[PDB]
Amino acid sequence: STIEEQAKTFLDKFNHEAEDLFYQSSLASWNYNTNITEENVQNMNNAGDKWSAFLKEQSTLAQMYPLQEIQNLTVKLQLQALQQNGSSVLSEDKSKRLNTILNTMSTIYSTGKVCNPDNPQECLLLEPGLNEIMANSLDYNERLWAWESWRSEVGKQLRPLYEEYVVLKNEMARANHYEDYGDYWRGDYEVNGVDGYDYSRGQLIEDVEHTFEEIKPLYEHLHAYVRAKLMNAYPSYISPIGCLPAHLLGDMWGRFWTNLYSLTVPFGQKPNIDVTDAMVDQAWDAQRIFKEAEKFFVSVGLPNMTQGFWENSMLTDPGNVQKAVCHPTAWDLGKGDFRILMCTKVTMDDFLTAHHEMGHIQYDMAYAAQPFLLRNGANEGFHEAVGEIMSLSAATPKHLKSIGLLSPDFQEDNETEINFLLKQALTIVGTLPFTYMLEKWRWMVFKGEIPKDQWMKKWWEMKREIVGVVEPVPHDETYCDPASLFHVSNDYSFIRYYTRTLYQFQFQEALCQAAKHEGPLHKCDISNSTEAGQKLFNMLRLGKSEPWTLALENVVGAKNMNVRPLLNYFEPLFTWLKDQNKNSFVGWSTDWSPYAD
Amino acid sequence: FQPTNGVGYQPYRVVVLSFELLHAPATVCGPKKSTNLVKNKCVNFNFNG
Numbered sequence: 001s002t003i004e005e006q007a008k009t010f011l012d013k014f015n016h017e018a019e020d021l022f023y024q025s026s027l028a029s030w031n032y033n034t035n036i037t038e039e040n041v042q043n044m045n046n047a048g049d050k051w052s053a054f055l056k057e058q059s060t061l062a063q064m065y066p067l068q069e070i071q072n073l074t075v076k077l078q079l080q081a082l083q084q085n086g087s088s089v090l091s092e093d094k095s096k097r098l099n100t101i102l103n104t105m106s107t108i109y110s111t112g113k114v115c116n117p118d119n120p121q122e123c124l125l126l127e128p129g130l131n132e133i134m135a136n137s138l139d140y141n142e143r144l145w146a147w148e149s150w151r152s153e154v155g156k157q158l159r160p161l162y163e164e165y166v167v168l169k170n171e172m173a174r175a176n177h178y179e180d181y182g183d184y185w186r187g188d189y190e191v192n193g194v195d196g197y198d199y200s201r202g203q204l205i206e207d208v209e210h211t212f213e214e215i216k217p218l219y220e221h222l223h224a225y226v227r228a229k230l231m232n233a234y235p236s237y238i239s240p241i242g243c244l245p246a247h248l249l250g251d252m253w254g255r256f257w258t259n260l261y262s263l264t265v266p267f268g269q270k271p272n273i274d275v276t277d278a279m280v281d282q283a284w285d286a287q288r289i290f291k292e293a294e295k296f297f298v299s300v301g302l303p304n305m306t307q308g309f310w311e312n313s314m315l316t317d318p319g320n321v322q323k324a325v326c327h328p329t330a331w332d333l334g335k336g337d338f339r340i341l342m343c344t345k346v347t348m349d350d351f352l353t354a355h356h357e358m359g360h361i362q363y364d365m366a367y368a369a370q371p372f373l374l375r376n377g378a379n380e381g382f383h384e385a386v387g388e389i390m391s392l393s394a395a396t397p398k399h400l401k402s403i404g405l406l407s408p409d410f411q412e413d414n415e416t417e418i419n420f421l422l423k424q425a426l427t428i429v430g431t432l433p434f435t436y437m438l439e440k441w442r443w444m445v446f447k448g449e450i451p452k453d454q455w456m457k458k459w460w461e462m463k464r465e466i467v468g469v470v471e472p473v474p475h476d477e478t479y480c481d482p483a484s485l486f487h488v489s490n491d492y493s494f495i496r497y498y499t500r501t502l503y504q505f506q507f508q509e510a511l512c513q514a515a516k517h518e519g520p521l522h523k524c525d526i527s528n529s530t531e532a533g534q535k536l537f538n539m540l541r542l543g544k545s546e547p548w549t550l551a552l553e554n555v556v557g558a559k560n561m562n563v564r565p566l567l568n569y570f571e572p573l574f575t576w577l578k579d580q581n582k583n584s585f586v587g588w589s590t591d592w593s594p595y596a597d
Numbered sequence: 598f599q600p601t602n603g604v605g606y607q608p609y610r611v612v613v614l615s616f617e618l619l620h621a622p623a624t625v626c627g628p629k630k631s632t633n634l635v636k637n638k639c640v641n642f643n644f645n646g
């Protein structure tokens with residue numbers, strides 16, 4: 001009778017159709033990814049077109065439902081997640097132009113190939129050529145050449161395309177009732193209608209800035225230690241007061257400094273904790289690793305995994321007759337279908353990533369009882385946070401000793417713990433300043449706060465200030481160095497990584513509290529802890545059916561994001577870095593640059 | 598219904614048996630196993646009630 005009842009019936013019908021349609025699309029995607037063939041591409045295109053047309057039709061038929069008269073929170077949330085026209089709010093021509101520019105930028109980033117001046121015909125792509133060059137090769141000249149060549153042959157092409165994509169997204173968000181496309185992306189974390197749990201889009205910026213300023217002393221000490229080690233490696237290329245070169249950080253964008261771990265290891269003589277040799281001795285394979293992960297997840301209290309997973313999911317490389325993407329992916333295909341697509345080898349890294357993927361699958365099946373619209377994580381930073389905490393728990397030395405991989409005679413000392421903490425820092429908090437500066441630069445770009453004529457000249461400012469990293473060579477506005485990254489060139493929110501890192505640290509701290517672990521936070525293991533698993537599943541089953549603020553409160557007791565668990569995790573490492581940086585300058589100088597003598 | 602469908606989506610044949618005991622005389626019952634017919638010995642017996 002009422003419009004709310006009609007909306008509920010329409011949503012139920014849409015969910016019933018969408019379950020089957022998305023199941024078919026996901027099955028086609030699984031077949032294509034396991035076996036990349038032209039027919040697989042064809043059926044993938046067919047399924048994608050069908051799914052997109054169905055979603056657009058349902059969105060159009062839902063937008064006519066007025067959301068203000070609907071008092072059911074679930075129904076209103078489902079409709080607003082459906083009634084989102086998106087870039088279609090613009091005209092057909094403007095939307096087509098925006099999509100074409102997005103595809104062009106994605107192609108340029110993917111097909112970005114730089115040719116050395118010595119041999120014009122000899123060219124290398126970003127992956128695996130440039131990435132290997134900037135992560136393994138320690139030569140200053142080669143890394144600088146690769147970095148400059150990429151940001152020139154890719155940045156100059158992308159700069160007009162990136163600007164036009166930015167303005168099109170901004171006008172779409174303005175027609176989508178957002179101040180800018182940055183606000184459009186911040187609306188993902190936005191919560192409304194829930195007393196004591198509502199979240200505003202600017203609150204995301206406020207929380208990110210506050211958490212980054214909390215990390216600022218720890219990041220400054222880590223940067224000081226890394227710069228000191230690099231001076232021990234490159235005394236004539238990095239100033240002790242000046243910022244770090246962009247190309248000398250283990251990657252093009254300086255995102256991850258773990259590649260500098262070999263150059264910044266606290267104790268190089270201390271052996272690294274790795275039971276890969278034990279796995280080889282115990283003849284562990286993909287099935288054994290997955291079985292151990294399932295046993296551990298049963299120990300923490302989660303239900304045993306479905307056998308249909310084993311029937312359908314692939315664990316090893318599917319031979320060579322068919323080509324498959326060996327990237328670790330967790331597939332929630334719907335209609336009771338849960339799989340993992342990854343070629344698992346005998347190593348600690350594959351162990352951790354398999355545990356990450358199966359934690360993703362466990363989270364996905366936790367909220368499977370939710371309707372089709374609610375069968376997703378509450379925010380883009382929740383599922384990956386679960387995967388990361390699963391990987392961390394699986395990487396605990398206590399768990400390795402319990403399963404027999406780590407022999408009991410193995411000793412844990414302060415130096416090994418410091419090495420592990422520093423490696424974790426380079427992996428995790430190495431990108432947090434970079435993520436924050438890139439996200440803030442994108443926010444201002446979408447808001448129009450940074451004019452084009454200063455774009456690069458503004459970007460390298462915060463690189464020198466927020467990250468304390470200076471570009472080795474000056475870059476004009478023709479350069480589009482922010483677009484040199486995947487997400488900027490492919491229109492993906494980058495704050496997801498910072499949010500998921502903070503969420504995973506909070507969840508790990510809460511799980512250690514529930515499991516009542518004794519000792520350092522990085523040594524905390526949730527093995528044989530049923531209560532922690534039950535508490536985690538209490539909101540893993542919620543998924544996105546409830547506000548993510550409420551879910552975070554139900555885990556850590558805090559309704560907002562913070563880095564206090566990160567401080568607890570890195571406190572021994574923070575003290576060690578502060579002790580080491582007594583003779584090395586802490587901070588950076590924006591004025592100094594490698595290109596200025 | 599596909600062979601690759603999920604565990605909860607594979608087909609399941611289900612039969613529901615309602616044992617109604619209305620005024621009509623009882624018709625269906627158990628086998629009421631006929632025990633071995635001993636003889637010439639004191640034994641309690643039951644022949645059709």
